[PDB]
Every structure is written in structure tokens, then in C-alpha cells.
């Protein structure tokens, strides 16, 4: 579990969105595993606007933040799961690290701010849904 709270937006993994998220929908994209809903209170997170390929992610199954090197956001083949058929996920970045399904939602961050959230993994690899290109998270 986990979300990014920036301005009046809550950014969560689309496959973990609640009924309340769907009833206050702002934007969703299945190919990116992302859903954004509106909030009452303002959020404290800032979105990174950079091209960092090194950062730190939160791993709930270890209660630890790990430094990682990660690939540039791309279209990657992701295996069938209880949430999606075996399809290509877009804007996905890969790093060598520990993760389990419930680690989804952990923030990946750099010196500039929040870069993305845990979305895929298995076998020593963790994948993050990039959010740096979503310039509209900073305004409105
Ligand atoms: C971080 N993480 N996430 C998933 C996962 O199954 N996510 C579901 C949304 C769909 C994408 O494949 C996973 C599995 C096994 C180890 C790690 C994992
Ligand atoms: Zn950065």
C-alpha cells in the first residue's frame, strides 16, 4: 500500500484504488497502473522534474529505504497477475531490489522529489510507475 499526496491529488496504483478513489476520479491509466483521485486537504509531497536514474525506494516488507539505480521509463512486458492480463506496461522503470506484491505504493524519490511508486516485481527486480512527466500534478 501507499500513495503520493501532492496538492489536492492522491496518486495510487490503479489496481489498489478504493471505491472512494473511483467516486472522486481525476485520471486513470491501466497501461501505467496509475490512478489519481481528488483530496480535501493539501498534500506535502513534491514531484521530481528531472532525469535522475539513481534514487531511494521504500520497501514495506523490510521497513527499510534502499538506494537503487533504475532504468529510464519504458514499455516493458509484465506477466499475468490477479490484477492484469500478461501485457506491456508503459512508463515503467526497473531496479535490482527486494519487493513483494504488498510493497506496491512505496515511493521512489531522488534529490528533486518523488519520482514514482512501486508497481511490479519478482525475482530480485522491482518496477516503478514513473510520474515525472505528469506536469499537471503541480497545478489546478
Ligand atoms: C512489487 N510487486 N508487485 C507485484 C505485483 O504482482 N503487482 C500487481 C499489479 C500487478 C503487476 O504485475 C509483485 C509480484 C511479486 C513480487 C513483487 C511484486
Ligand atoms: Zn532527480
Swiss-Prot record:
Membrane spanning stretches: none
Q: What does this protein do?
A: Cysteine protease that cleaves viral polyprotein and specific host proteins. It is responsible for the autocatalytic cleavage between the P1 and P2 regions, which is the first cleavage occurring in the polyprotein. Also cleaves the host translation initiation factor EIF4G1, in order to shut down the capped cellular mRNA translation. Inhibits the host nucleus-cytoplasm protein and RNA trafficking by cleaving host members of the nuclear pores. Counteracts stress granule formation probably by antagonizing its assembly or promoting its dissassembly.
Parent-protein start and end of this portion: 869 to 1008 of 2193
Protein name (database record): Protease 2A
- Which top-rank group of organisms is this from? Viruses
Residues bound to Zn(2+) 1: 50, 52, 110, 112
What is the reaction catalyzed? Answer: Selective cleavage of Tyr-|-Gly bond in the picornavirus polyprotein
**What binding partners and quaternary form does the record give?**
Homodimer.
Give the positions the UniProt entry annotates as the active site.
15 (for protease 2a activity), 33 (for protease 2a activity), 104 (for protease 2a activity)
S-S bridge residues: none
Task: Name its species.
Answer: Coxsackievirus A16 (strain G-10)
